[PDB]
Amino acid sequence: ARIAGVEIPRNKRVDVALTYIYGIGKARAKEALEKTGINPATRVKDLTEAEVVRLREYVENTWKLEGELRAEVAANIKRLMDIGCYRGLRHRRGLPVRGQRTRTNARTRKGPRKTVAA
Amino acid sequence: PLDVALKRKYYEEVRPELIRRFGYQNVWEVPRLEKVVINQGLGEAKEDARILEKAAQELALITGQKPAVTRAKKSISNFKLRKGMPIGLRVTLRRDRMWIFLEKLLNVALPRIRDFRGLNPNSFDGRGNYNLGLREQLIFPEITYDMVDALRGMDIAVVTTAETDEEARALLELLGFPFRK
Amino acid sequence: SLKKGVFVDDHLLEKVLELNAKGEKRLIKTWSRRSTIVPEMVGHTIAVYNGKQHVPVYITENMVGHKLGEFAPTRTYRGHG
Amino acid sequence: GKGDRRTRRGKIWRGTYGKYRPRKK
Amino acid sequence: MKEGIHPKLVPARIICGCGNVIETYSTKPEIYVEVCSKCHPFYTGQQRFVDTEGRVERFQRRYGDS
RNA sequence: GGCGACACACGUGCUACAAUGCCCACUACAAAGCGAUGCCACCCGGCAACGGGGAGCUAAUCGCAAAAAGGUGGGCCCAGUUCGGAUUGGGGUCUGCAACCCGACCCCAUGAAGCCGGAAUCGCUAGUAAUCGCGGAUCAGCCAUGCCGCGGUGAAUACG
RNA sequence: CGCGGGGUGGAGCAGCCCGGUAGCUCGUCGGGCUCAUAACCCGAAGGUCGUCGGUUCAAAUCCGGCCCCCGCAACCA
RNA sequence: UCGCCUCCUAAAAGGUAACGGAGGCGCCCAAAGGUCCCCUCAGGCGGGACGGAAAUCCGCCGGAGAGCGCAAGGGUAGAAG
Numbered sequence: 001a002r003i004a005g006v007e008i009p010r011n012k013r014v015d016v017a018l019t020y021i022y023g024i025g026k027a028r029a030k031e032a033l034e035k036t037g038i039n040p041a042t043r044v045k046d047l048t049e050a051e052v053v054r055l056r057e058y059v060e061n062t063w064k065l066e067g068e069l070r071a072e073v074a075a076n077i078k079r080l081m082d083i084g085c086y087r088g089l090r091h092r093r094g095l096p097v098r099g100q101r102t103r104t105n106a107r108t109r110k111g112p113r114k115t116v117a118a
Numbered sequence: 119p120l121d122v123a124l125k126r127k128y129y130e131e132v133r134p135e136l137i138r139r140f141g142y143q144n145v146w147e148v149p150r151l152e153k154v155v156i157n158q159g160l161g162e163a164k165e166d167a168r169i170l171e172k173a174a175q176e177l178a179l180i181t182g183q184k185p186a187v188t189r190a191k192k193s194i195s196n197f198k199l200r201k202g203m204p205i206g207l208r209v210t211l212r213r214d215r216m217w218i219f220l221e222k223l224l225n226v227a228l229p230r231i232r233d234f235r236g237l238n239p240n241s242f243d244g245r246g247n248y249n250l251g252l253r254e255q256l257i258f259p260e261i262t263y264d265m266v267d268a269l270r271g272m273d274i275a276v277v278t279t280a281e282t283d284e285e286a287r288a289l290l291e292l293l294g295f296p297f298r299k
Numbered sequence: 300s301l302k303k304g305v306f307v308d309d310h311l312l313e314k315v316l317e318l319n320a321k322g323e324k325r326l327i328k329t330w331s332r333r334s335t336i337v338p339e340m341v342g343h344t345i346a347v348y349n350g351k352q353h354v355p356v357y358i359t360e361n362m363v364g365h366k367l368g369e370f371a372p373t374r375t376y377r378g379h380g
Numbered sequence: 381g382k383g384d385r386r387t388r389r390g391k392i393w394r395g396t397y398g399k400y401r402p403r404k405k
Numbered sequence: 406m407k408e409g410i411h412p413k414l415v416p417a418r419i420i421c422g423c424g425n426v427i428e429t430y431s432t433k434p435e436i437y438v439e440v441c442s443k444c445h446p447f448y449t450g451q452q453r454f455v456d457t458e459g460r461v462e463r464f465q466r467r468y469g470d471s
Numbered sequence: 472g473g474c475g476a477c478a479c480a481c482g483u484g485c486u487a488c489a490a491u492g493c494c495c496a497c498u499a500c501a502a503a504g505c506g507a508u509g510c511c512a513c514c515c516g517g518c519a520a521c522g523g524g525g526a527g528c529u530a531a532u533c534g535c536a537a538a539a540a541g542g543u544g545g546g547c548c549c550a551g552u553u554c555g556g557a558u559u560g561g562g563g564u565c566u567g568c569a570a571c572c573c574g575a576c577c578c579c580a581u582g583a584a585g586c587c588g589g590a591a592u593c594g595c596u597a598g599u600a601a602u603c604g605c606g607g608a609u610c611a612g613c614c615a616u617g618c619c620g621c622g623g624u625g626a627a628u629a630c631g
Numbered sequence: 632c633g634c635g636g637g638g639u640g641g642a643g644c645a646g647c648c649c650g651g652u653a654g655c656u657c658g659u660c661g662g663g664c665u666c667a668u669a670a671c672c673c674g675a676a677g678g679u680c681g682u683c684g685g686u687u688c689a690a691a692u693c694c695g696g697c698c699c700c701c702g703c704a705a706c707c708a
Numbered sequence: 709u710c711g712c713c714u715c716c717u718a719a720a721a722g723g724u725a726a727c728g729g730a731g732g733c734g735c736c737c738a739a740a741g742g743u744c745c746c747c748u749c750a751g752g753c754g755g756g757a758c759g760g761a762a763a764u765c766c767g768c769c770g771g772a773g774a775g776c777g778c779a780a781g782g783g784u785a786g787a788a789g
């Protein structure tokens with residue numbers, strides 16, 4: 001069933017299918033699994049709506065996920081920009097923001113290559 | 119069935135709060151809620167008119183009415199579009215059936231919207247009716263989520279006999295419409 | 300990251316802590332870009348050195364945990380050809 | 381793999397210890 | 406409403422994050438809703454759980470004591 | 472402050488794209504080096520980095536030390552995935568007068584490109600090539616995937 | 632003046648006829664092979680279709696004006 | 709250039725010339741025909757997911773500027789659309 005906005009995990013395995021939520025994976029999963037006293041080894045296909053609603057209630061209440069989570073990391077960076085801050089500039093120009101020589105491949109952050117003449 | 123909770127809730131505590139607030143002399147002058155028109159601009163399905171009967175089937179399911187199929191008005195080249203072809207489905211509800219849907223929408227659909235910090239306060243059209251767009255259709259209860267092949271939204275038009283938005287907002291708030299203030 | 304810490308240089312720390320309790324506020328040129336900023340810094344106009352000159356940087360409440368050289372960048376760019 | 385710092389194999393490679401490679405013998 | 410080619414629309418029972426709605430009156434009776442943002446969680450009867458605006462708020466606290 | 476720049480181009484590399492593989496628990500087997508301005512067992516606090524305490528050793532006499540692969544056992548079921556961990560957000564530890572520019576590391580979230588790489592091109596003939604860990608120099612710390620070394624398991628194939 | 636043809640990536644041709652998609656050779660750029668250059672190999676970038684106006688859903692393509700280009704003709708006097 | 713159609717020249721009936729000014733035809737439609745019933749445009753402002761000057765949807769204003777297979781003219785929503 002569906003948690004945190006919509007975000008339906010299905011089948012698979014319950015501690016794994018928990019990763020598929022925004023803001024959650026590994027730790028934050030195997031934690032709320034016993035905290036709600038639920039077997040992690042089970043499969044989200046079948047389980048009592050009991051262990052289902054106990055499970056959404058925890059998670060959706062505990063921490064912020066999905067929309068509001070992304071909205072927070074947004075305004076966090078918006079904050080780094082427009083405060084004229086260094087890291088802000090590296091966000092403003094879409095260049096690597098920590099350490100990181102840019103003379104050669106930044107590519108993940110820089111985009112694919114745009115070649116020019118010698 | 120002529121009962122329909124929210125319908126009741128309109129006469130039996132929305133109307134009075136309205137007369138009290140705007141000071142209406144005549145029984146009619148106090149705003150009535152008529153005709154919510156759901157319309158899928160579906161031009162997504164353009165060449166495939168097969169996709170459409172799935173989408174029309176789904177509207178019926180969440181309305182109680184099969185929608186009219188709109189057709190293209192003028193032929194326009196920039197995106198495909200022969201003059202004849204179907205653009206989308208468009209369905210009119212009123213009178214009970216509008217309420218029984220408008221109830222379900224208010225208590226179920228809009229809740230199920232990802233995020234949702236509330237309905238836009240500026241969408242009133244100035245002669246005091248209200249339009250609002252939706253993106254995915256699985257936020258309705260009648261949808262099983264395994265019956266969606268693709269995701270088609272709709273524009274929703276709510277027409278009211280209020281002569282201004284100030285009055286139209288009030289009617290709609292008091293009915294329980296979650297405005298973003 | 301320090302914590303038992305929050306290193307600020309004592310040189311400007313003086314002239315700032317003064318400009319509260321002296322009552323008066325104005326433009327103060329410092330070389331110390333290693334230092335952290337605020338609380339009694341906010342609203343002061345501090346000139347930070349980039350290696351070349353002193354850059355005016357206005358101060359506000361979300362500049363808080365940020366070192367003084369964040370706001371004085373060291374390299375001139377404007378892109379390529 | 382040897383670059384997942386969140387794994388056993390990774391930690392060993394970077395040479396470090398933690399929740400994924402706690403030091404016990 | 407023309408007879409034939411139509412969803413049934415029969416009185417129903419519907420549940421959710423908190424209670425029911427005896428109202429129902431829908432096609433496909435007895436349906437299961439995820440959460441009504443109004444059980445008054447989620448922004449209505451404003452909960453404002455796990456609130457924002459801590460980032461200008463925190464950097465001032467661990468900051469000048471140490 | 473810069474040598475750490477970033478529209479770009481090349482050389483040497485590392486981690487991979489997974490099921491002869493990934494993760495978790497348990498169980499084994501090395502060599503060569505280093506350290507009483509240091510190496511720190513063992514105990515406690517901490518998810519952890521680390522911090523408190525604190526015994527031994529001028530060291531075949533104490534410490535770095537867990538070797539890793541392997542072994543057993545269970546999990547994953549071919550999925551851009553329990554593959555892969557780049558990027559970024561927040562939280563911290565440490566060295567150091569000082570980590571904005573530029574440190575290493577820990578946790579939480581984020582999880583990108585990548586499904587064996589055009590033309591072309593490198594190394595290796597045996598305890599070698601592949602693959603797996605380990606130590607030292609420099610050194611406060613460290614950008615070491617480097618360099619110099621040590622052992623573990625261990626192919627293929629040479630008509631000519 | 633007259634009649635015919637043309638004007639499109641940097642160069643030279645196609646596409647217009649029959650509306651909807653611009654192509655081919657060279658050149659240019661990045662890589663490769665070479666001690667090195669050329670030759671050669673693997674990749675890419677590049678045109679708004681002379682111009683204005685018109686028709687159509689839509690114009691390089693059909694129509695009209697003008698601006699160039701080449702060819703032809705200008706006889707009895 | 710040569711037959712046909714529309715406008716002007718044409719001097720407010722008709723007709724009216726020039727190697728006067730401008731454009732079209734040599735088709736098309738089995739629905740684009742007959743009839744009965746119903747419906748009314750273009751455009752402008754506001755509102756509405758993907759929808760952008762423009763796809764579709766909802767409000768108001770809009771006597772015809774739209775449409776009438778193709779050129780122009782006359783005509784036409786009290787319909788010819």
Ligand SMILES: [Mg+2]
Pocket residue numbers: 098099100101614
């Ligand atoms: Mg770095």
Ligand SMILES: [Mg+2]
Pocket residue numbers: 099100101102475
């Ligand atoms: Mg750098």
Ligand SMILES: [Mg+2]
Pocket residue numbers: 240241242243244283
């Ligand atoms: Mg409004």
Ligand SMILES: [Mg+2]
Pocket residue numbers: 245246247277278279280281
């Ligand atoms: Mg109204």
Ligand SMILES: [Mg+2]
Pocket residue numbers: 381384387
């Ligand atoms: Mg992994």
Ligand SMILES: [Mg+2]
Pocket residue numbers: none
């Ligand atoms: Mg260098």
Ligand SMILES: [Mg+2]
Pocket residue numbers: 481482
């Ligand atoms: Mg080179």
Ligand SMILES: [Mg+2]
Pocket residue numbers: 484485616
């Ligand atoms: Mg390397």
Ligand SMILES: [Mg+2]
Pocket residue numbers: none
């Ligand atoms: Mg891919």
Ligand SMILES: [Mg+2]
Pocket residue numbers: 572573
């Ligand atoms: Mg730095």
Ligand SMILES: [Mg+2]
Pocket residue numbers: 586
């Ligand atoms: Mg695969």
Ligand SMILES: [Mg+2]
Pocket residue numbers: 588
């Ligand atoms: Mg390769």
Ligand SMILES: [Mg+2]
Pocket residue numbers: none
């Ligand atoms: Mg040999």
Ligand SMILES: [Mg+2]
Pocket residue numbers: none
């Ligand atoms: Mg090493």
Ligand SMILES: [Mg+2]
Pocket residue numbers: 637
């Ligand atoms: Mg030509």
Ligand SMILES: [Mg+2]
Pocket residue numbers: none
């Ligand atoms: Mg070349």
